[PDB]
Ligand binder design. Structure first.
Ligand SMILES: Nc1ncc(Br)c2ccc(-c3ccnc(F)c3)nc12
Ligand SMILES: [Mg+2]
Lengths: 295, 283
């Protein structure tokens, strides 16, 4: 376990620079005092309600953020406040300068990405998830908003706030948590009594590949509740355009299989030609970096 | 006394910008009358950096007269809306840094013979400072320079000591120098091991990760080693001796100089010529 009372005040160690946005708590552009090196700082208030969730996120971050496709944990701190205010805990991690995949799409003519970039980005997500799954971890919130880009267009995964730490390799879970539009049919276990696994993350990856392809996830136009209803009943989504590759159309086809038993595992999905057969990982990264930079 | 320093107007002149340093720029300079080349470090005078400016000019005047340390020629102050800028004039090291030489080299690796030669000169230079109660605190390929005749010179006394203050370059920092949560001459010897790996692999260990994830990893991870098995058993041993996370057990400068990778090294003239030939081939 972790002891929160053992965490020091961030005083002259780190400092907040500007507010980036909000999360599951706020997210700040922060800096390491002595070095001037940037970090993202997740400022969240200490409550006995969120305590069970706060503990898991710090645990997940300390253990697996070492992999290159996961935004790395730098440490945690607790800013102690007067009797008026709540104590706020800071999660310090790798600052991903370019922002989210979701933002990149928004700030792009047509709100679509070049297939080469989708293949590059998807691979990095798959590498990152393979790390997690091999370590008996389900992310449970894979979406473009949680797939970040550094200044050098490197792909990093974020938000362990809804993650799962399975015990056995044959272990299952049945909590029902995530973002409606990106949730897997099985994870919609709000009406059944029994179970899902690492496969759930692979569905969300297919939804995010569609998000990068179409600008938004399938069923974007409906209320999250309508989507929750439709996702199980409607057939597995596909790219509306015929201009995308046969490899991409196949990748989506493999990713989005409503029956998780028949849906391919992380290791086999990594073998897929859309992921495996890809050009100079360095050339695409640079091409993407060049696109990130504009107005 | 800083106010006793003359204006460099007509004495020395800046020719072109070589690069940048510790909150100050470095230019290729020229003595007006003689046409002779010098390194001029141009930095703004402030009462904040005053404590740091004073130490750099002090060490420069006291220890630069050694052969492995780029020699101090003098200081000047441009009197100026604008801030007064101080110029620190030293010997011009024509061939540039070890870091640059690596960058402008196919494979970004140096011949082991050159690494042994270069390392020895750094050790000679550090032995000088450590015997004189001085910690460099910023030993890196960018601060190890080469003259036209491929001679090795040390630079930047801006973070030096006469300790625990936490200053340097993340990758090169010694575990003990990472005293960022409330260290001696040995700290420089770690950085030398990192720079030997830099000359061997093109970059320091943990280069693939942000300086922050490196700051985190350096204490926790085991001491780095050369990833290739093609390097000598002597080189592999030298790195092994240099990089000992426990500074108490890490060998001193005098004993590290005794090491066979440094000591058992041939014609200091043949290697310097070989290196000179490589410097000249690249440009
Ligand atoms: N590390 C980063 N760097 C830059 C930016 Br912009 C980030 C935005 C959001 C997040 C983030 C991290 C953890 N949990 C979340 F829900 C969001 N991280 C950022
Ligand atoms: Mg000299």
């Amino acid at each position: 376990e972790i002891d929160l009372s053992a965490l020091r005040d961030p005083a002259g160690i780190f400092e907040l620079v500007e507010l980036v946005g909000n999360g599951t708590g706020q997210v700040y552009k922060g800096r390491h005092v002595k070095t001037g090196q940037l970090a993202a700082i997740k400022v969240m208030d200490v409550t006995g309600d969120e305590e069970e969730e706060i503990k898991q996120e710090i645990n997940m971050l300390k253990k697996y953020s070492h992999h290159r496709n996961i935004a790395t944990y730098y440490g945690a701190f607790i800013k102690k406040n007067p009797p008026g205010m709540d104590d706020q805990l800071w999660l310090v991690m790798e600052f991903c300068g370019a922002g989210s995949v979701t933002d990149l799409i928004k700030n792009t003519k047509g709100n679509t990405l070049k297939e080469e970039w989708i293949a590059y980005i998807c691979r990095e997500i798959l590498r990152g998830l393979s790390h997690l799954h091999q370590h008996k971890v389900i992310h449970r919130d894979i979406k473009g908003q949680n797939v970040l880009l550094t200044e050098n267009a490197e792909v990093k995964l974020v938000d362990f706030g809804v993650s799962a730490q399975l015990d056995r390799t044959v272990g299952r879970r049945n909590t029902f948590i995530g973002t409606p539009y990106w949730m897997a049919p099985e994870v919609i276990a709000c009406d059944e009594n029994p179970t899902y696994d690492f496969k759930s993350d692979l569905w969300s990856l297919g939804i995010t590949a569609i998000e990068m392809a179409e600008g938004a996830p399938p069923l974007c136009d409906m209320h999250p509740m309508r989507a929750l209803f439709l996702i199980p009943r409607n057939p597995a989504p596909r790219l509306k355009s015929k201009k995308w590759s046969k490899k991409f159309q196949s990748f989506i086809e493999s990713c989005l299989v409503k029956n998780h038993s028949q849906r391919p595992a992380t290791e086999q999905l990594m073998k897929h030609p859309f992921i495996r057969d890809q050009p100079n990982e360095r050339q695409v990264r640079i091409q993407l970096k060049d696109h990130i930079d504009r107005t």
